[PDB]
Symmetry: D2
Subunit: 389 residues, 4 copies
């Protein structure tokens, strides 16, 4: 029924690094043209562009429409942004699948984009401040990384799961090192090259082509990992080294019925067999993926053991270990090329970034059944099962 | 197959008016609870909440999830926000319907919410400003009302459509006055009572219950209308009087299969027969509804003549006249109780606001076929056809 | 040797009141024009303009020169601002006197101006804020009213003075109320008309002439003052009622040698016999007037008992009572037309505002010896003796 | 009559350089302690502290007093800041002299301090911004470098002066390069060591001692000056290389009667023989020094040819050449150790910084008569004559 004809993602930038002054719709446009080019589909055949994006403050009207127009998709197609926090990227793909499944569209470009670097500071000032100091709020932290129910950071929610699952520092640290070493190993062997579409950082005193994940760290040591101080709980266990980072990036998929891809002679990266989204306690939002994955598997008619490859988003080492511990899937087939701790976590783009890595790894090793899943702030999980053809 | 079991909207606040300090999710909570109580469905039975919202800067992580939790939808449910600018409120409902249509959900609350008053001022300040003044940008203007491709305001787009359609000042003014007069009549006659759920503005020095659309102007004259100066084009034709305003509000609908409503004893407000979204030139974005309405009639298998009631959002008199002129529907069945010029236009909530208006008027006059449509900044239209049961 | 030929002040405005959006330099230029007019002196004869001013942030290069240029003082004269906090308006007069006493000028305009309403919020942003919320600081509080050594408000130094002199709430409120009733009666009787020069607040939708002190409360009651909550110490004694307010105004004096005023046939408002400035502990800065008045009296060769009238500025009733208790002057000759609790406290202007008040009352009742004195944040006092000719 | 018993200055910091986060009062405190130590005068004997400062926004209540307290000056002493823009640090000395001349003080510490790096960005937000962007104003530019009458930067006044005196790019550049070459030669030979007092930048990760002017460029080339583009008039003649910079620093002098220096066995740096301040057209502010120096010499009884050494502040090479051309003093006795284009221009402190340079060079070469003068924004000049004893 619905297949991902092609896919592409930019490299994931570090915070205030290579994409520091790049609006997310510019990386979005590059990724949208990439998918088109890759499948051999003309921009004019796109019905709609669906892009998850959690932090658009200051970017102007509907950045998803700006991305589409800049990538050549005519003014006749439509475009919209959506937010389901970290799940956005993946959710958007399911939403475009639904556009086709109900017969409302033929071809959708879906994924997410995000510029955490470009997220601005703000204040509500229409009433005015008659007397006294007032806070300038960092919208990336307020609107993207702070739980709205308990007022604390995602990091504390990770601590909640750490304590609850009795996941020691050394255990999270071990997990972190492995994702670095695995992300570094994969990048060195050219395993991220099919998925990445170089992005040209338009300069003045030089244009720069970015085609490598700059957030991965080469030669990560356990010693350096164990000397870092806890970033959220002063006598905590979560640190900067075992937590994902603040990053920029964009990732997308080209969707169409399976019959359509056959009419066009396209070899699809996979069929979307199912997807799902379930809520959980906001305090332990990191557990999100447990219920959602299970549901997704139930809806696809598959067992956990049927999965050949898995991409479970690395928000925090504590949550990742808890996910894997509970689900019990074989660790060796999960984040084979490294995860968000090494790669990065451009919130609104991450769900599509991990779908790209899944998709191109599944083709590369010939795996048939796959699943991508992410935890979501506010206590939610999103999962999707993909099957190759 | 999918019906609108119940619906509710808060009154529409004036800018920095009744809801001046009310966060959009608060307005949404109340509309989530209203739709739930008006259909007899428990919050625990809600699977997902979808809320169109264009300006959430600074409201924290995913205001839709905040709204849902505040209203009592359990943490096991899911929520998300989406942005197709002005069509957001209506598109949510279509998106929600698709959730049930693909069997991924049973019961959904969809609509939109917006606090234009609470939109903050922002600046990207991570680099630091070594020297020189910098701009604190109004996200309301920048992210909600400015065309991202031509840099001008929506009002200019309206001017483009007036010139194009040769719509004179007097003819735009005549439409505005009638909109005010129909809204005022409607309000005096208790015609907005069913759809409105009174909202309690939690005070300190007292609570204030708001149950009336405060932006409608009583006794609007043609003289006062003709004295106003053009707001966007210095020697233009669009004024503050013949353009909608800046406003706050929320509206939603409770969706479920026709079968499910039947199992429950609910008498639905309507069956969603079709919906459609189409793009047009950003410069003449107000023509959006033409192609969109036509596409949705096509998908429903209806002729324009088949409609008994229409709600075509009045962003600007010049675009509303163009639309009506083009489509040729009977003016007498369009915005029977007044439109956005009088009622206001809380961006992300406006499509759900007009769906409420349509739906309660179809039940009260016994209309069978109705259509709701809105122009969208960036150059898009959205439309939905509803049939009574 | 040096006399005050004439003086003028603007009415004192309420915080964000009649001069809510009037830069201080506009209020200062009207006072410069009035002192000139009053003395029969032309703006081309002024050598230098000296204006105390504590909060000039954002008003642009040297506001004293902006006021001087606006008044028509030639470009060949000079002008400068100074800041000895609340004693500023009075210390500028002392400093203007000194220019003439040393032969460096013949004609000086000296006093103060302040727009507390127009003070801005600020932040040091050159280095950049990598991430996190940051404070926008009210410059009026931080630079005008917070002690820099102890970090608390001037209000807390008043509580310190209340404890140490054992001043009860009741005694302070009675002083406060008498301050209001004396001001009201001298306002109603027209005793502020001579000193005040009307200020024209330039409208758009109408020019407004301001010629009355608007912070003075009419029919102030003991009861409503008694009911107020402490404002600085949750369980203190200083309240908004018995403390001075936040205000806007300007005030000045025209100076020249006695011999010069004699050549011109000018009947001066008085001779500056002496002045003094002395420091005290910043914790009890309200006590400043004690050592400073004793020193000005000593330098004049006068006993406390030789004074006929006194203007002892009312920062807080706690400190005014203390000052009066220690000096032991007859209370009936102190602030006979009310004081700053009623009239207000536009920080840099205050010392010249009370000087104007002293001057015009000395002329009206034929008082021969007077003194003006103020307390100063930071732990200082300033006083000036004046004798009539 | 009045002498300068001792003097000291901190090295001049580069913009956002060595003193990037050092509040001005900390730099002033080290210079007050240096002057005391230098004169064998204890802080308990100081009567008053007078500090020129143009941009104190956000540093808290009267920074002059903060500096004085930090240096141990007793709370019984007084302190104030003043602002005659660029003339401030020199005016402070003339005003402190006046304190003593009139018998109100015996011992004064007077000069200036400025942290242009710490000046903040601000906005008047008390009335609120109902809608539309607002500017965050750079207080350094607005309040220190922008002319309030014509709206343009001090650099445009320099273009006015270059046009009017027909100073070519080439001649300004040759003046700029010799200013750098002379300051560098003086720094390398140890000539700034007597006047500089080392300032310790209290760090966390290490304390840094700053005792070298860091803005002076070594091996400055004419070629590099010539290639620069005009900074203020796109087709102008003033550039970043021929203009002074934005800088941080403090400087002062300790003052007492000549008879009191004699009682103490102090060998003073000089006798203040006269000073003067005169205005000029704001558009040609740079010419300030002409009438002020001519008036100061007149008051001294000196002809221009009587001076042995001159410090004429180099705001811009255009105005410094105009001054020199008009006055006609032998250029080889002016700014013999380089001037502000090389050393820097910490607005409020500059006048005291060049007074320190004059004094210590007069003592080294045995120069008997000197003069220090500066141009001032808003159209003013200040000058001081000094004779050695
Ligand atoms: C459901 C969900 O998915 S919710 C999650 C959505 N995203 C999040 O919740 C946020 C996760 N990320 C964050 O919030 C941030 O990245 C934080 C708070 C963990 C870290 O923020 P910062 O302190 O600004 O990060 P930063 O990159 O500076 O880390 C600090 C240091 O850790 C070091 N570090 C990080 N990883 C490693 C590692 N593997 N090995 C060694 N050093 C490391 C960095 O190199 C840096 O060194 P430095 O101090 O010399 O610069
Ligand atoms: C696809 C699309 O939908 S795009 C549309 C999305 N929304 C928009 O595009 C914006 C349209 N609305 C706007 O941008 C604004 O409301 C504007 C620019 C037209 C007006 O903004 P403002 O100038 O701040 O509006 P405001 O309410 O002050 O109008 C000014 C005056 O007009 C008067 N006025 C307005 N309507 C009338 C009337 N019918 N009769 C008499 N006077 C009237 C107001 O009462 C007011 O009088 P006042 O100056 O004494 O207060
Ligand atoms: C050495 C030196 O001079 S330092 C002194 C320099 N100035 C200062 O130190 C500060 C003194 N002033 C202040 O800081 C402020 O005015 C404060 C903190 C005391 C009050 O600030 P606010 O709380 O914002 O003042 P505000 O005007 O709102 O007073 C609150 C209320 O008291 C009421 N009130 C004040 N005086 C009276 C009175 N005499 N009778 C009855 N009610 C009164 C006001 O009407 C107001 O009523 P409301 O809440 O219904 O509006
Ligand atoms: C009365 C009165 O005194 S009014 C005067 C008060 N002060 C003023 O009016 C302002 C004077 N100064 C200024 O406004 C500023 O210094 C300006 C606008 C001229 C320059 O500001 P900026 O552009 O930010 O200065 P900046 O230090 O970056 O200069 C730019 C470049 O010129 C280069 N430059 C400056 N001088 C030289 C030189 N002598 N040789 C070679 N290069 C030089 C700098 O090295 C820098 O190179 P980069 O771009 O690789 O960094």
């Amino acid at each position: 029924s619905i297949v991902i004809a092609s896919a592409a993602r930019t490299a994931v930038g570090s915070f205030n690094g290579a994409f520091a002054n790049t609006p997310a719709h510019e990386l979005g446009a590059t990724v949208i043209s990439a998918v088109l080019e890759r499948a051999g589909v003309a921009a004019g055949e796109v019905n709609e562009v669906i892009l998850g994006q959690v932090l658009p403050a200051g970017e102007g009207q509907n950045p998803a429409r700006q991305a589409a127009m800049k990538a050549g998709v005519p003014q006749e197609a439509t475009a919209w942004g959506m937010n389901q926090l970290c799940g956005s990227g993946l959710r958007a793909v399911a939403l475009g699948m639904q556009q086709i499944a109900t017969g409302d569209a033929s071809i959708i470009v879906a994924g997410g984009m995000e510029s955490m670097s470009m997220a601005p500071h703000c204040a509500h000032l229409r009433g005015g401040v008659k007397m006294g100091d007032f806070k300038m709020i960092d919208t990336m932290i307020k609107d993207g990384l702070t739980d709205a129910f308990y007022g604390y950071h995602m990091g504390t929610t990770a601590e909640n799961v750490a304590k609850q699952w009795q996941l020691s520092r050394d255990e999270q640290d071990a997990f972190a090192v492995a994702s670095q070493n695995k992300a570094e190993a994969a990048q060195k062997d050219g395993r991220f090259k099919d998925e990445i579409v170089p992005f040209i950082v338009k300069g003045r005193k030089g244009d720069i082509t970015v085609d490598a994940d700059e957030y991965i760290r080469h030669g990560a040591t356990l010693d350096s990992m164990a000397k870092l101080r806890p970033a959220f709980d002063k006598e905590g266990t979560v640190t900067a080294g075992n937590a994902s980072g603040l990053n920029d990036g964009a990732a997308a998929a080209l969707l169409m019925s399976e019959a359509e891809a056959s009419r066009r002679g396209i070899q699809p990266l996979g069929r979307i067999v199912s997807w799902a989204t379930v809520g959980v306690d906001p305090k332990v939002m990191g557990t999100g993926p447990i219920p959602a994955s299970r549901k997704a598997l139930e809806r696809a008619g598959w067992k956990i053991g049927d999965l050949d490859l898995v991409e479970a988003n690395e928000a925090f080492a504590a949550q990742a270990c808890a996910v894997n511990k509970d689900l019990g899937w074989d660790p060796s087939i999960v984040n084979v090329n490294g995860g968000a701790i090494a790669i990065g976590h451009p919130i609104g783009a991450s769900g599509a970034r991990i779908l790209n890595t899944l998709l191109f790894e599944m083709k590369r090793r010939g795996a048939r059944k796959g699943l991508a899943t992410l935890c979501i702030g506010g206590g939610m999980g999103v999962a999707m099962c993909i099957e190759s053809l």
